[PDB]
Symmetry: C2
Subunit: 313 residues, 2 copies
C-alpha cells in the first residue's frame, strides 16, 4: 500500500472529518475513556488535523519505507512490517472500537500518574485513524509563583506538575490494520521493541561470524549492546543486498580495489577476512553491507548515503 495511497486515505479521513474522541491507556493495560472539555476538544482536533496535514497531506517529501529498513530520514513514516505487535499495538486496536455507549471512563483522582499513553481517535469517511502519544515527564513547565499577598520579584516554579500534556505530536498511528511509526525511540523504548531488534541483530551477528568476513567480531559484539548498532544489524539481516548474495572473495576484492573503501576499511594482514573492530570502522562496514557506498554515473563522485531507495520497484 503505497505512500500516495496513504495520502489519499488520510485526506479521505481528514476532508470528511466526522468526530474525535480520546482514549487514555493506563499502566494496567485497560483503555479508560477521557473527559476532555468541548472547547479544548475542538482546539485539539484543529491542531492535530493541521499537524497531520503538515506531516502527511502537504508533505511532498513524505516517504513510507519499512521499519525494518531503518534509515535516517526526517519527515518519514515507517511501515510496521514486523510480526510482533507490542501490547500497546493491541491496545490501540481495541481503542479503535470502544462502543460509544460505554461508561468505562477514566477517574481523574488518579492524578495522571496512571496515564501511560494517550490515544487520539480521529475518524473520517467511516474509518478511524488512531494516534498514540506517551505520558512524558511533564516537560517541567514552570509558572511564576506570586505567593506574596495574592510579586514583581517572584520566581518561576512548576506548581501542579501533574497536568496532562499532549504537545500535538503523534509518536505513531494506525489506519485500518496498518501501523506507522514517526518517533522510533518511543517504539523501541516505551513499547519495548528493542528485544526484537536485538534478536534480529544477533541473527545478523551469527550470519557475519558464519560468513567469515571479519577477523575479530568482539568489536561488533561489543557495539551490538547499543541499539543504534542493533537497528543497523537488523537492517542488514533482513535487507542486505550484499550479505548472502555476493560471494566473500568479491567483497574482499571490492574493498581492496575501491580506493576510498580500502582507506576507510582496513584490509586483513592476510586477505580472506577483514579486520573491523573500532566504532567508526564498524559503522563503515555496516554501511558497506548496506550498499551505501555508491558512485555517480554522471559526475563519477563517490558518496555516503544516509537514506536511499531502490527505483526499479
Amino acid at each position: 500500500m503505497t505512500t500516495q495511497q496513504l495520502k489519499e486515505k488520510i485526506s479521505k479521513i481528514i476532508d470528511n472529518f466526522s468526530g474525535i474522541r480520546v482514549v487514555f491507556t493506563t499502566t494496567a493495560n485497560e483503555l479508560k475513556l477521557s473527559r476532555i472539555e468541548g472547547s479544548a476538544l475542538n482546539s485539539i482536533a484543529e491542531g492535530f488535523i493541521d499537524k497531520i496535514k503538515e506531516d502527511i497531506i502537504n508533505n511532498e517529501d513524505l516517504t513510507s519505507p519499512l521499519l525494518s529498513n531503518f534509515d535516517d530520514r526526517k519527515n518519514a513514516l515507517f511501515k510496521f512490517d514486523y510480526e510482533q505487535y507490542p501490547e500497546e499495538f493491541n491496545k490501540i486496536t481495541q481503542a479503535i472500537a470502544i462502543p460509544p455507549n460505554s461508561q468505562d471512563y477514566y477517574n481523574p483522582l488518579n492524578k495522571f500518574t496512571d496515564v501511560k499513553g494517550i490515544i487520539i481517535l480521529i475518524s473520517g469517511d467511516n474509518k478511524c485513524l488512531a494516534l498514540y502519544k506517551n505520558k512524558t515527564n511533564l516537560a517541567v513547565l514552570r509558572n511564576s509563583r506570586k505567593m506574596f499577598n495574592l510579586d514583581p520579584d517572584g520566581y518561576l516554579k512548576q506548581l501542579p506538575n501533574e497536568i496532562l500534556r499532549l504537545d500535538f505530536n503523534y509518536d505513531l498511528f494506525s489506519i485500518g490494520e496498518d501501523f506507522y511509526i514517526k518517533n522510533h525511540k518511543t517504539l523501541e523504548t516505551q513499547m519495548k521493541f528493542h528485544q526484537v531488534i536485538e534478536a534480529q541483530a544477533v541473527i545478523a551477528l551469527n550470519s557475519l561470524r558464519d560468513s567469515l568476513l571479519i577477523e575479530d567480531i568482539s568489536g561488533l559484539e561489543k557495539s551490538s549492546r547499543e541499539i543504534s548498532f542493533a537497528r543497523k544489524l537488523a537492517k542488514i539481516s533482513k535487507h542486505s543486498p550484499v550479505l548472502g548474495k555476493i560471494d566473500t572473495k568479491t567483497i574482499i576484492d571490492y574493498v581492496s580495489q575501491h580506493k576510498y573503501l580500502s582507506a576507510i576499511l582496513q584490509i586483513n594482514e592476510a586477505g580472506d577476512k577483514l579486520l573491523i573492530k573500532t566504532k567508526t570502522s564498524q559503522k563503515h562496514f555496516i554501511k558497506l553491507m548496506s550498499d551505501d557506498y555508491l558512485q555517480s554515473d554522471l559526475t563519477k563522485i563517490i558518496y555516503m548515503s544516509i537514506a536511499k531507495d531502490r527505483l526499479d520497484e
Copy 2:
C-alpha cells in the same frame, strides 16, 4: 570544524559543568534575565544535559553537515554557513555575555506573552554553550477542572494558558562563534530565514535559465513559492555537482541512457533542451542536479539518495 571536534567540545562543557543561567529574549530584542527557582533550575540543567548527550555525545550516528547543504537526515545538527545572521543570532551572541551582576531582569507581570524565545546558557570548561527555544504553534496542555465543594461532575481543561513551557527541546544552539541548527522550521519561520532561501532559489532559477538546459521554467517558478522547493533550489545553487558544468548535451545523453530517468525526463524534439513541467518531473530533475541518482559498483542497482555525504573529505 569536524563532528568529532564538536563531540569533544560538548563533552568538555558537559563533564566540566560549571553552571546554568537562563535568559529570556523578548519581542523588543532585549535580553531580560529570568528568575527560575533553584530546584527547577536544577531540573532544567539535568534535562537539558540529558538531551544534549542523547543528541550529540551518545548519538553515534550524529552528522554535522552545512545548512546550505540541506538534506533529510535525523540526528543531524546543521552548521550555519551563511553570511546573514538573523536577529536572534546576535541576541544569543549577546546572551552569552550578560555580566552576572546584571539586574536587567524580566518582570513577570508580562504574563509570558512578551516571551519570544528562551535562551539556556549551559557553561562548562570555561566555555558557554547557548541553547534557543521558541513557542511552537502546535503546543497545548490540559488540567482537570472539577470542584463542586472543594459527585462525578467535572472535565479536563487547560485553564492558565500563560504558563511557560520550555519543552526539553532546543531548536538551535551556539558554541563559541559557531552556530548549529536542529529545528530548521524554527529558523525558516520564526527567524524568517525563508527570504534568504527564496533569494537563493531565484538565483538558482536564473542560473538554470543561463545554462540553457531547460525549455520552460514556468513550472519551476510556480513550485518556487513553496519553501520545500526553495531549499532544494538553494542546495543546487550553492552545491550542485551538475549545474555549473557546461555540458548540456552530455546530461541529455545521460538522461537518454538512464533507464528510469528517460521515462520521466523527456527530451525536446531538437534534443538540446529538457521538458520539465510536471511536479514529478521537476522533483526528479531536482534530484538529478543533486547527483542523487547513484549506481552501485557492486550490486549494479540504481538508487535514490535522500541524504548523502561527499566522501573526499
